[PDB]
Amino acid sequence: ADQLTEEQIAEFKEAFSLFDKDGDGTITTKELGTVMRSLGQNPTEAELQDMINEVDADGNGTIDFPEFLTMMARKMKDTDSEEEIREAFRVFDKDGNGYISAAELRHVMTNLGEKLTDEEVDEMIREADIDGDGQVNYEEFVQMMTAK
Amino acid sequence: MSYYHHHHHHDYDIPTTENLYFQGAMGILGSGQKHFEKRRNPAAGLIQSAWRFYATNLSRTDLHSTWQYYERTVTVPMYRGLEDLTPGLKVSIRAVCVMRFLVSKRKFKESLRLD
């Protein structure tokens, strides 16, 4: 599953073409960092090298278009990689009914990983049918997010 | 260099002895500093990279560039070229979230396993 239809190739094409400068045909670390820097969020030089290690198995250090397309596309939208996501929650759940409380959920989301501000934490709640007590069923939340 | 000093006085200050004790083996909430502790940062990254992958809307500016195109339409003059190279931020977010997510899976696996 690399596309459903050829329309999606246009979305992938300009996503690549935002990164590539001057038609050299492959994305180097300088180009990859440059788009993010112009937008206004700049990863570390170490992070950029870590990123272009895991992507690009040819191992030359410049990202090719079908390799990028393969990375973007993979299997389309799916209930993907569940054991990796699901067990990640299980390291840090509140109690043996399978939930995380909202106050702790905001504190981990704000201060770890990608570091959310409070409104986008509330947006996570807003996509799930939660009323009253504010306790999040992570296993169900993963089903809703990765629905197909 | 720096030391802590305390004062002790009186007799029979706490005669009752119903101090709590453990009569069995049960799970206790904790972080194992050597290894288990270092999984906090990747797990949060993996979860929040995945959320971006789902997201159709975010608190960030999507529609602002379309409002600038409406200001272009109000002027009476017409230009064949139109806007040039409009930066695609929503497309850019889609491109970086998948890379961040794939890296996050490897980082979760190289924090599940540690030295």
Ligand SMILES: [Ca+2]
């Ligand atoms: Ca290039």
Ligand SMILES: [Ca+2]
């Ligand atoms: Ca390459």
